[PDB]
Structures are given as structure tokens and as C-alpha cells.
Amino acid sequence: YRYTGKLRPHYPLMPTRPVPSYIQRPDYADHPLGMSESEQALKGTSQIKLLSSEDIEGMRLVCRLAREVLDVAAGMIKPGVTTEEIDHAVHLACIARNCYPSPLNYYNFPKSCCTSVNEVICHGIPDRRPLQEGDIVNVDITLYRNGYHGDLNETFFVGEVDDGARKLVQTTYECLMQAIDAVKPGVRYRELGNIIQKHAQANGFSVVRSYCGHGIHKLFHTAPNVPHYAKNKAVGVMKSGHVFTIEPMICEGGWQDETWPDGWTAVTRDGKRSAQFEHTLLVTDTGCEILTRRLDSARPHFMS
């Protein structure tokens, strides 16, 4: 394999971390290939669930806990910490909240979170590499509690970063929030990418096309698919009671991606940097509830 930038994987990985059996597990956690037969049974649909009041309380809970776990990871970002050390803290933080770390064994993903440094677009595997001053790193968290998943991510600065990194991360966050500010009953899901791309392109950046926001509730991913680029063909109209993510991946150079031989790590083909932010949203009767928001502080960690 010809690497696209300076990053390399730092092996070996630790053996997979067990989750105590008192923690409730999603179907795929015990499947030998990590397949989710509840996702498979619904493979085949654009129909979107309307959540019950019961489901809304379960989503509110797991999303608040997921935010608490992202905040634990945020407090670890400093030069010299390895991404495996971040993952270990996340794993234990999930278990302390009586939650399963949804990534773990999902289609045999080997870790409890994704850590995406520099040219990694998404799904980076925590490994032995120490963070370096000047890096940007995304940590993506998903928890499972009482049959519900909750999903969020933020990009962080590692010590001092250059102006390009600041502009990329700020723009990506602004893309997410402009999209969120448009969510309300009656808006087509395909509109959000028109908003995102407009702001990215105005700032000289590109939008990843191979990954999208997703419905999330009893399944980790389900309908709707929410592309982040303009003039997409997404199906559906937002209604109160829909729950889904918005998770734009914005790149310094071109938008084209490729995957490492590990089968997960998505990188820019040109080796330039990418950033991402994500929230889980509930559509309400007149707008949206940001389930994964910070309750205690005004701004994302990179601005705090």
C-alpha cells in the first residue's frame, strides 16, 4: 500500500477489551463477523421511524451519556498521549455509565471509539501513535444504553496549531451548525448538503461524499441517509419525531477518499487534512433538539 500522507498505523494493537457481562449488548456484539441482524432485517428501506415518547426519553439519556464520554476524551488531548490511551479511557467511561461502546465489534471494528488524526477522514483506529503538537484529531463516540444508541464527535487541537488547521476546524463546525439551524418539520433531508457545501466551498474546502449522516435509535445506522454535499438525491422529509445525525467531513484539498488495508481508516487521497463534527438531532414540532449538546458550556472544546 502507498500511504497518502505522513501518517502510518502504529502496531501492534492491544487485544480487544472486554465489556463486563452486566452491561446490555447490541445484537452484533456477539456475532462472529460483527453483523447486526436488526440492521440487516431493515436493510432495504427509506422509511423513517417516528419515535415514541418512550424512545425519546431513551435517546435523550444515551445522548447525554455519550456527551459525557466525549468530554472525558477531550480532557486527554495533549501532545504525547496515544490514541489507544484515549480509547482505554473512553471504554472505562462507557462502562462506568452502564453503557456498551457501540463501535466495539461493529462489523469487527476493534476499538471502542474512532480517533482520526490529520488526513484521516473518519474511522481511524486507536493505536500506539502519540499525538504530536500541531495535530488535529477527531474523537467519535457512540454509546448503547437500554436498546438505544447515541452518537457525536468533535475535532480537537493538539497544542498549538497552524492557521490552516484553525480555519478548517472552525469552518467544519460552522457547516454543522448551519445545517442544524435549518432542521424543522417539512425540510427535505437533501437540503442540508446544499447548505454545508455552500459554506465549505466559500472557504476553499471540499466535502467528503462517501460517508453521510444517518438515522440512529434502536439501530446504529438506519434511514435516513443524510449526504453533506450539494445536489444529492437523498430521500425523505423531516417530521417531528425523527432522529438522525449530521456529521460533515470537510477537507483542505480534494474530497476523494480511500481506505487503508485495515479496512476502516478512511483517508484523503491527496494526504491533506480533514475535520469533522457530529451531533444527534431530534426533530421537534417547530425545530430540533440537539441531543448531544453540551449542557454546561457554550462552545465546542476547540473554542473553549
Ligand SMILES: *C[C@@]1(O)CCC(=O)[C@@H](OC)[C@]1(O)[C@@]1(C)O[C@@H]1CC=C(C)C
Ligand atoms: C462511522 C460512520 O458513522 C461515519 C458516517 C457514516 O457514513 C456512517 O454510516 C452511515 C458510518 O460510516 C457508520 C455508522 O458505518 C460505520 C459504523 C461505525 C463504526 C464507529 C466503527
Ligand SMILES: [Co+2]
Ligand atoms: Co451496518
Ligand SMILES: [Co+2]
Ligand atoms: Co454518526
Ligand SMILES: [Co+2]
Ligand atoms: Co459518529
Ligand SMILES: [K+]
Ligand atoms: K482528521
